[PDB]
Amino acid sequence: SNRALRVLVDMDGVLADFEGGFLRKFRARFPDQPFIALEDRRGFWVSEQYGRLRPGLSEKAISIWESKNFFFELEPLPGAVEAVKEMASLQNTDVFICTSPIKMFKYCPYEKYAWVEKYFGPDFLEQIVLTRDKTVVSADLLIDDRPDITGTGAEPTPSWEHVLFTACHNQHLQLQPPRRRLHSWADDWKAILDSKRP
Amino acid sequence: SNRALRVLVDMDGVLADFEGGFLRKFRARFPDQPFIALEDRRGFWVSEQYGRLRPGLSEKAISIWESKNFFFELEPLPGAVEAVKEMASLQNTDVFICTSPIKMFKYCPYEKYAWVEKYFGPDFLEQIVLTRDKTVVSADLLIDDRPDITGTGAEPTPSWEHVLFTACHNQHLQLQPPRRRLHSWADDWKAILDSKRP
Ligand SMILES: [Cl-]
Ligand SMILES: [Cl-]
Ligand SMILES: [Mg+2]
Ligand SMILES: [Mg+2]
């Protein structure tokens, strides 16, 4: 609730299970192709790992998340909806969902709004920021599964502290101190927010 | 081209002729209803002025911009595309298009991306920021036709200076010094940018 601590919450990999949705739909569509089990995922870009696996598989992978209903049908991560609803109800706390669309824009922007409406309600649509460059969005915190966030972004010194949210693709990564992780929504996110308050 | 001066350029009323597109489609769809000529427009919210004109006309007005192809078919303002292309090519200048979607999200986000692709090309899609709250986007300048920009926004002290871009609905407004206007894209926008440079 609305100086408020401002928290940017990423969508794919934090609220929505992109990795699991992708794998399931990839195996269904391309049952004769090899795949990458989640525990074996390494690196942020799915299509790059698939492209190394077999020739043509980058393009096949892309075709999964370019398809209609891919984004809309993603399942929420455990605890994500509940945590963000609670976070948004806290005193002196403003929550925005900060998400980057894919390059093919026929479905993805629309479906992200629709997904937010479905899980958070119409009033939360006000809190969505769509951008490929999150460094130009000012906040105290950014909770996001992408390790390299600057990429490179236009703002060399973002205002936010990036808290890395654990995902299959980043779980083994050693971070440079003092970078921090949120391991799951079961982990103590309130303590992370409180550490940034006056 | 990519510390760079960062300029947020609004879409409706700055790049795209929302007011003229709206009026034309309103008169075509509702030929028996009264309308507001552009010179008589007052206040940012179109639907509010229409609602005062006749009962039910707010809802009719809304139905124009909720329709498919409304946003996509908007015409560029004179000089807008050319100016923003030139601006983006300047040394030490990063340009983002910063636009607020309407509440009904079936078409508007998609069509705004499609509009940018059509006039600026695929590579400029990277520069789009969609948000209802522009105060959380950091920059040196925001060129926008809306007079009241904070509304109220979550950031009480935005980083940008708001330069009011003239539109039919704001052309008579007296601003509190030191607020500034860009009267049209024919006006000297380079001088405004240069005033913010080191
Ligand atoms: Cl999923
Ligand atoms: Cl138009
Ligand atoms: Mg993510
Ligand atoms: Mg505008």
Side-chain angles (χ1 to χ4, degrees), chain A residues 1-2 4-38 40-67 69-102 104-175 177-178 180-198, chain B residues 1-2 4-38 40-67 69-102 104-175 177-178 180-198:
Chain A
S1 308
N2 306 136
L5 187 76
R6 193 181 314 139
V7 184
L8 307 179
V9 184
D10 183 34
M11 194 162 181
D12 297 307
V14 176
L15 298 178
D17 185 8
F18 184 106
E19 291 277 348
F22 166 75
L23 180 57
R24 187 177 179 178
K25 282 176 171 178
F26 181 89
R27 291 190 66 183
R29 185 167 170 195
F30 300 118
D32 300 332
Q33 291 295 337
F35 60 89
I36 308 189
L38 299 190
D40 298 329
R41 278 280 293 111
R42 300 291 189 278
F44 187 69
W45 302 113
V46 173
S47 69
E48 291 184 351
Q49 193 176 8
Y50 275 72
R52 289 189 278 276
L53 183 60
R54 168 184 295 190
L57 278 193
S58 175
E59 293 87 344
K60 294 182 170 66
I62 291 163
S63 80
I64 302 299
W65 54 77
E66 293 195 349
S67 295
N69 288 132
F70 179 74
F71 286 93
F72 184 67
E73 294 178 355
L74 297 181
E75 296 290 336
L77 268 74
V81 175
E82 309 86 334
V84 166
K85 285 167 170 281
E86 182 169 20
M87 187 187 297
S89 78
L90 297 178
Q91 292 173 34
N92 305 311
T93 310
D94 290 336
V95 178
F96 293 80
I97 296 173
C98 186
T99 182
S100 300
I102 64 164
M104 206 286 282
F105 55 79
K106 182 74 205 80
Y107 313 112
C108 168
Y110 165 62
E111 291 182 12
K112 287 175 170 288
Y113 282 83
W115 194 97
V116 172
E117 183 192 58
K118 169 180 187 154
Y119 288 108
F120 295 101
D123 293 345
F124 218 73
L125 296 165
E126 296 296 338
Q127 306 309 122
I128 297 169
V129 179
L130 262 294
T131 182
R132 299 262 305 169
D133 188 342
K134 305 192 186 182
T135 73
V136 306
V137 185
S138 61
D140 297 286
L141 284 164
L142 170 61
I143 300 168
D144 190 308
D145 65 317
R146 181 175 181 181
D148 55 325
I149 304 171
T150 60
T152 298
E155 178 48 62
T157 62
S159 57
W160 35 253
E161 174 186 354
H162 176 213
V163 176
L164 187 67
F165 190 90
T166 298
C168 55
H169 62 78
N170 73 33
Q171 66 182 132
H172 302 284
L173 285 181
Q174 187 173 4
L175 310 181
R180 291 207 271 197
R181 272 190 191 263
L182 181 60
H183 297 87
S184 63
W185 288 104
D187 191 12
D188 189 355
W189 59 264
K190 289 179 181 177
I192 297 176
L193 273 60
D194 284 352
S195 76
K196 310 297 294 185
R197 302 181 188 275
Chain B
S1 308
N2 306 136
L5 187 76
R6 193 181 314 139
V7 184
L8 307 179
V9 184
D10 183 34
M11 194 162 181
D12 297 307
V14 176
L15 298 178
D17 185 8
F18 184 106
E19 291 277 348
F22 166 75
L23 180 57
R24 187 177 179 178
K25 282 176 171 178
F26 181 89
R27 291 190 66 183
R29 185 167 170 195
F30 300 118
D32 300 332
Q33 291 295 337
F35 60 89
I36 308 189
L38 299 190
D40 298 329
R41 278 280 293 111
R42 300 291 189 278
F44 187 69
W45 302 113
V46 173
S47 69
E48 291 184 351
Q49 193 176 8
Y50 275 72
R52 289 189 278 276
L53 183 60
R54 168 184 295 190
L57 278 193
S58 175
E59 293 87 344
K60 294 182 170 66
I62 291 163
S63 80
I64 302 299
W65 54 77
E66 293 195 349
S67 295
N69 288 132
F70 179 74
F71 286 93
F72 184 67
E73 294 178 355
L74 297 181
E75 296 290 336
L77 268 74
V81 175
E82 309 86 334
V84 166
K85 285 167 170 281
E86 182 169 20
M87 187 187 297
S89 78
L90 297 178
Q91 292 173 34
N92 305 311
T93 310
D94 290 336
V95 178
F96 293 80
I97 296 173
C98 186
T99 182
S100 300
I102 64 164
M104 206 286 282
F105 55 79
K106 182 74 205 80
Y107 313 112
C108 168
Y110 165 62
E111 291 182 12
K112 287 175 170 288
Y113 282 83
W115 194 97
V116 172
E117 183 192 58
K118 169 180 187 154
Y119 288 108
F120 295 101
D123 293 345
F124 218 73
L125 296 165
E126 296 296 338
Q127 306 309 122
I128 297 169
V129 179
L130 262 294
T131 182
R132 299 262 305 169
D133 188 342
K134 305 192 186 182
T135 73
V136 306
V137 185
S138 61
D140 297 286
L141 284 164
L142 170 61
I143 300 168
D144 190 308
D145 65 317
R146 181 175 181 181
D148 55 325
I149 304 171
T150 60
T152 298
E155 178 48 62
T157 62
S159 57
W160 35 253
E161 174 186 354
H162 176 213
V163 176
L164 187 67
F165 190 90
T166 298
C168 55
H169 62 78
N170 73 33
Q171 66 182 132
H172 302 284
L173 285 181
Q174 187 173 4
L175 310 181
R180 291 207 271 197
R181 272 190 191 263
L182 181 60
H183 297 87
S184 63
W185 288 104
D187 191 12
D188 189 355
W189 59 264
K190 289 179 181 177
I192 297 176
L193 273 60
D194 284 352
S195 76
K196 310 297 294 185
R197 302 181 188 275

